[PDB]
Every structure is written in C-alpha cells, then in structure tokens.
Design a protein around this ligand. Structure first.
Ligand SMILES: NS(=O)(=O)c1cccc2c1c([N+](=O)[O-])cc1[nH]c(=O)c(=O)[nH]c12
Ligand SMILES: NS(=O)(=O)c1cccc2c1c([N+](=O)[O-])cc1[nH]c(=O)c(=O)[nH]c12
Lengths: 138, 96, 141, 41, 96, 197
C-alpha cells in the first residue's frame, strides 16, 4: 500500500519522493520487510525505510535496539475488526471497541506489548565535555 | 506443545478478543488463515485470498487482526471503528 | 439538510459574506468535505447552523440531546458534517462514518526564545567539570 | 557596495563594553598603585 | 588577566561569527530561492498576463508562489508598472 | 609571561605540560564560543510528556469540565496518573474555562504554562499570528472526527465509502494542507549581533 500511496499521490512532497522513487539505487525498493530492516541496519545511515508506525516502534523496542522511528506519520489509516455483512456481531463489537478505547484498555495493551516487553529502554548541551580534552589531562 | 487451544496463543489481538468477547458475552475458538495473507481479490478470478475470504464465504464469524481499513474490503465486509490508528513513518539507523 | 459549526478552520463566513446569499458565504474544511461527499453521493445540500450547544451532548435529567446530535436524532437535519467526535454514547443513537481525520491530545508551549544572557554565561563554552579540573590541575601543577 | 566603516573593527563588541573596559583599566591601575605604594614597609 | 582573556577571546570569536555569517549569505539567484524564503515580498501587476500565468500554473514552484500570492502584504500586487519600480526602489530590498 | 622560569629539567617538564594544557584549553574555549555565537540553537525544555510530569517549574492544565480532563481522571497509565495527581493538587487552578483562555495564558507567560489540547487546533494555532506557540511531542490519545447520520438513514454506506475513497486517493490530506499549512500565515539567517555588556 505504500508504493501505491506514493504513486497515486497528489501532494507536492510525496510527488517529489515518487519522482526520486524508482531511481537507480539500483533498488531502493525491497521484497520483504525483514529485508528492509536488515538493509537499514547494514547501511551506515545511508538507507531510510518507510513502513507502518506500529512495526517501526516494535522494532525500535527489539534487540539490539539499533534503529529508531523519526518524524510524524505521512499518511493516516487504521486497523479494524471485521465481521461478515449482515451479521449480529456488528453493533456490539463496535460499541465494545469504543468503550475499550475510552476506558484506556487499548492504550495499556499497546504499552504492554510494545514497551513493557521491549529489550531496550523506555526513553543536549553543546558545551565542551571532559571527554573531548581527556588526552590533555592524561 | 505444552498448551492446547487458545491458551497457546499470546499477543495484543488475543487479549483484545478476550475483552471483546467478555463484553459481548460469547465463547470463541481461535485459528489462523491457512493462506497466511491478508484479504485481497484476484483481479480476474474475482476471489478473495485471505481472512476476508474466510469471512465472506462463511468460514469465519469474526476477524481480530491488523486488518487495514480500505474501500475494497469495506464493500464486502463490515468493519469496526479503528481500535488502532496508524500511518506511514520513517525508520533510520539509531545514531550511535 | 446538512449541519455544521463555526469552529474554525472547519466552518467560517467568507470575507464580505453580506454579498454572498447562501451556501457560498461559508468557507473552510467541513464545507469542501460536504461538497465532495455530495458529489460522490449526488444529493444536494444547504449548509446550516444550529447553535444551542454547538455540539452533541445529553442532559441526564431532561434526557434530550442537544446540538448536531440532538437535531439528527429528531429529524431536524439529514447529516452532520463537522469536527464531531466519535464516542460511545453518540454511536448508540446515531451512526458514524470511518474517521476522516484522526487526532489526539497534544502539548502546546510558547516557542523558546533567545534566552536573556545569564551572568556567568562566559563559562558556557566549557562544562563545569572542565573548569573544576582546571582549578585542581592548577593547584597540582 | 556597503563601504565598511573606519572603526568597524570595534563592531564585535558594543560601545558600552569598550567604555567599561577603559573604566576598569583605570580602576585596576589605581588599585594596583595604591595596594603597592601605601604601606611604609 | 582573567578579564583580558575572556574579553579577547570573545572579540575573536564574535568577529569569526560575523565573517562566517557574511560568508554564508547566498543572495537570490532563482525563483526557488525567492519561493522558499519569506523575508522579502514579491508581487506582480494586479491585471496582466503574469497574474494569470501564476494563477493557471501547474508547476510546483509557481504553485507555491501563487499560494503565497494574494496574501496580506497587504498588497503585493500593483496597478502600474512605474508603481512597482518605485515600490522596489523605496523598499530597502524588502520587495521583489 | 613570567618573571621567573624553571631551570631544572623536572620543573621545565612541569612547565611544558602546563603550557600545552593552557594552549589547548584556551583554543578550545575560543573555538566553541565562536561556534555558539555563529549558530543559534534554541532547545525546547520538553520533547515528550514524561519530561512534563517530572518537571515542576512548568505548569500544565486542561479545560475544566471537558473530555480531556475526563480522560486524565479515569486513566490507568502511570504518567497520566501522576499528571492527574498534580492537576488535582495544583494551586492556583491550572484548569481553564475556555480554549482561548488557555491559549492566552500560555502566550502571556514565558515558558511557564503548557496547555494540553487536541492536535488539530494546536497545529492550527502554531500557524496563527502571533506565531508564538508550537506543538511538542507525540499524541497521548487516539480519536477521530466522523460524519454522523440518523439511525436508519440510507446515507450511511455511501458516506462511509466516500470518506474511505477520499482518504485513499488523498483529498483529505490536501484539504488539511490547504486550511492548516497553506492559508497559513507563518511558514517553516539573522545577521550576527555585537556582544552586549
Ligand atoms: N492488510 S495489509 O494492508 O496487507 C496489512 C495488514 C497488516 C499488517 C501489514 C499489512 C501490509 N500490507 O499492506 O500488505 C504490510 C505490512 N508490512 C509490514 O511491514 C508490517 O509489519 N505489517 C503489514
Ligand atoms: N465533540 S466535542 O468534544 O464537543 C468537540 C468537538 C470538536 C472540537 C472540539 C470539541 C471539544 N469538546 O470536547 O467539547 C473541545 C474542543 N476544544 C478545543 O480547544 C478545540 O479546538 N476543539 C474542540
């Protein structure tokens, strides 16, 4: 959906991205998401991946914790709970989801399975530090 | 192998389904889409390939997974208000 | 019979709205949205306003809905196109669409300014630890 | 073509700093003279 | 001695700052440089082919210019060309 | 200079290393001061919400009798529980009666008050004259603005599909850019100043 979103974009910035996109990287694109993560990790900051925010956060909280998410979200979409057309589990399910969201359940589960189970942590001055001039003191 | 049924599955969606069924008040049995792919139609065959198929063909009664909300699916499926908003984002090497 | 609320930049009255008669004086985000919605659905609409609360809510005693929700429940309007928040109580009495704009709580601060220079800002180029090591290296030498 | 002013080499520091530099020079010199030539030691 | 050290170092450092900044200064040399910046205002004749060209433009940069154009200068636009020349001459580089 | 310099090898060693140290340190001071005076960098004290809870110098409050306060009240996350404790034990009243009141309270003060509100109005105001505010950190809640309809209207499915189509193609993003960033006063270098007393 990301390639389609960029291709079919009417915005200036993403239009410029698409103009750059499909260039001679040779291959900025990728086939597997794990492939993109590995490529970014191998590259010494020379590659940036575009992906869903949730997975970006999860990966950021995964060992070795050598990658980060930066910036806001280019697009805006959602994940939902599906029932077949003409089912009796339509209204009750939507009501339950909304009640959970107001009660804060979903945010708590998010924090639990993204941060309270992350291998990594939870979370300035340009003044010269003693590490810069240590050799002088030695 | 130690646990059988739903007790062997752990994750966000599992607890979400637990809470949802608790509020609705129904018993549920989990499974997994054999195709292991999210719903999508064959352009020529006009057949859905994934959990959307397991829903619209009567195989399944509800889907609790990261189903992206789209126009193609919303026509043949009844979604719920998003439980997780989301977007495209930028991933970079963590500056050492 | 669509509905709207003056909360900007969703609904606002265009400059020199006395000249404009109706459905063209208004400007904003919700109005363009209603235009596109009507285009994709076909129906014709006349933008309106309600006041009387400016949004949906319920009085526990009166048990009567007010605002856009109140009028939609009671037939005074066809649909409401506005920054109307999705909530449990409202979905029980009306039907929402999928969100056309997702948001959340955030933090507003005053922009950091060029701080008034502090007395002893001439030490800032070096950290305090460097200065103390300098003092004690002077002593030791 | 902005013609640089003569005494543009003073621009890095404000006029007040130069003024108070002169004042502090005078005070330092006087205090040195005093604390060096007061005690009949 | 301490006072002297601080003062001389400050003089040298601020002079370096002055010269470095005076060396960064890249004047306007293209439509893009004018487009991104906003410290200078730019406007064309009120009625003419230039206003139409910008309004009816499908290009990114001139689209951004038009988005800026018709702003609260109050009036970037002008009625007479001599008026525009005089306005640019009076402005201390604040109009293009 | 010096009215005396050492004549022995040991004293001369000491003096030489002291001289090297002095040279390096003075050069570093001058160079880093030149950096400071050449590049202005204003750091926001806050880049998140935990930073806001730990800080006590900065005060923060919501709009009184609103959904945001109801959110903080019934919260289960630790950080927001701490914020609720603070806001319930705060003198004077951090809370406010109107949005404009909170905006004015933030603007009049100088980095002392932080206002918790919706992302959309914050983004809008960050583009208003005076452009003396900005939004910091991420979002502490998820919500959406939705088109409504009476129960049983034939307009439900069409409007759902219309908003979904618009989102997929990209109309809504363009409208947001048009009414928030474009049509926005301040978008997104100053000569160096002489040092003052
Ligand atoms: N229904 S879906 O929309 O099929 C979809 C649903 C759920 C997760 C997806 C996903 C897609 N996608 O687009 O293919 C790509 C993708 N990529 C990742 O890296 C990741 O973590 N999760 C996903
Ligand atoms: N449905 S709503 O929920 O009625 C509601 C809808 C839309 C915008 C709201 C708003 C509420 N509110 O909470 O009362 C407060 C508020 N405060 C602001 O500062 C702002 O910009 N927008 C809003």
């Amino acid at each position: 959906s990301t390639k389609e979103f960029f291709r079919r974009s009417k915005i200036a910035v993403f239009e410029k991205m698409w103009t750059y996109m499909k260039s001679a990287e040779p291959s900025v694109f990728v086939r597997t998401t794990e492939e993109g993560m590995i490529r970014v990790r191998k590259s010494k900051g020379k590659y940036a991946y575009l992906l869903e925010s949730t997975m970006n956060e999860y990966i950021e909280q995964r060992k070795p914790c050598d990658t980060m998410k930066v910036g806001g979200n280019l697009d805006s979409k959602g994940y939902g709970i599906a029932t077949p057309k003409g089912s009796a589990l339509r209204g009750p399910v939507n009501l339950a989801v909304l009640k959970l969201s107001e009660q804060g359940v979903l945010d708590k589960l998010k924090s639990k399975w993204w941060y309270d189970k992350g291998e990594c942590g939870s979370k300035k001055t340009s003044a010269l530090s003693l590490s810069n001039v240590a050799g002088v003191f030695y | 192998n130690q646990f059988e049924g739903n007790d062997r599955y752990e994750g966000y969606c599992v607890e979400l389904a637990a809470e949802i069924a608790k509020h609705v008040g129904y018993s549920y049995r989990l499974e997994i889409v054999s195709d292991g792919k999210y719903g999508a139609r064959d352009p020529d065959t006009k057949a859905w390939n994934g959990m959307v198929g397991e829903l619209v063909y009567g195989r399944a009664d509800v889907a609790v997974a990261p189903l992206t909300i789209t126009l193609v699916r919303e026509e043949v499926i009844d979604f719920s208000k998003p439980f997780m908003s989301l977007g495209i984002s930028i991933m970079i090497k963590k500056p050492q | 019979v669509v509905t709207t609320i003056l909360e900007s930049p969703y609904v606002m009255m265009k400059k020199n709205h006395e000249m404009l008669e109706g459905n063209e004086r208004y400007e904003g985000y919700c109005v363009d949205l209603a235009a596109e919605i009507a285009k994709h659905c076909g129906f014709k609409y006349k933008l309106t306003i309600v006041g009387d609360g400016k949004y949906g809510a319920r009085d526990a005693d009166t048990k009567i809905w007010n605002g856009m929700v109140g009028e939609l429940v009671y037939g005074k309007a066809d649909i409401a196109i506005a920054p109307l928040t999705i909530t449990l109580v409202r979905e029980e009495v009306i039907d929402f669409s999928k969100p056309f704009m997702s948001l959340g709580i955030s933090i507003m601060i005053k922009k950091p300014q060029k701080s008034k220079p502090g007395v002893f800002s001439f030490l800032d180029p070096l950290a305090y630890e460097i200065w103390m090591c300098i003092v004690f290296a002077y002593i030791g030498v | 073509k902005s013609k640089p002013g003569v005494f543009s080499f003073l621009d890095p520091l404000a006029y007040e700093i130069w003024m108070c530099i002169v004042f502090a020079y005078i005070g330092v010199s006087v205090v040195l003279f005093l604390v060096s030539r007061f005690s009949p030691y | 001695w301490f006072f002297t050290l601080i003062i001389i170092s400050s003089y040298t450092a601020n002079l370096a700052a002055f010269l470095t900044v005076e060396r960064m200064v890249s004047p306007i040399e293209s439509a893009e440089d004018l487009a991104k910046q906003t410290e200078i205002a730019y406007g064309t004749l009120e009625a003419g082919s230039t206003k139409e060209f910008f309004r009816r433009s499908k290009i990114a940069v001139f689209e951004k210019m038009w988005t800026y154009m018709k702003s609260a200068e109050p009036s970037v636009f002008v009625r007479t060309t001599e008026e525009g020349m005089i306005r640019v001459r009076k402005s201390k580089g604040k109009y293009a | 200079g010096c009215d005396i310099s050492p004549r022995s090898l040991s004293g001369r060693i000491v003096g030489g290393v002291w001289w090297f140290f002095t040279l390096i340190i003075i050069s570093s001071y001058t160079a880093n001061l030149a950096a400071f005076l050449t590049v202005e960098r204003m750091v926001s004290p806050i880049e998140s919400a935990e930073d806001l809870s730990k800080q006590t110098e900065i005060a923060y409050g919501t709009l009184d009798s609103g959904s945001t306060k109801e959110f903080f009240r019934r919260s289960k996350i630790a950080v927001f529980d701490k914020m609720w404790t603070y806001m319930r034990s705060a003198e004077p009243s951090v809370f406010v009666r109107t949005t404009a009141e909170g905006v004015a309270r933030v603007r009049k003060s100088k980095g002392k008050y932080a206002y918790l509100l919706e992302s959309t109005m914050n983004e809008y105001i960050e583009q208003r004259k005076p452009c003396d505010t900005m939004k910091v950190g991420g979002n502490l809640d998820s919500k959406g603005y939705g088109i409504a309809t009476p129960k049983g209207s034939s307009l439900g499915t069409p409007v759902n599909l219309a908003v979904l189509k618009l989102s997929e193609q990209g109309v809504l993003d363009k409208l947001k850019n048009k009414w928030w960033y474009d049509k926005g006063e301040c978008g997104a270098k100053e000569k160096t100043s002489a040092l003052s007393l």
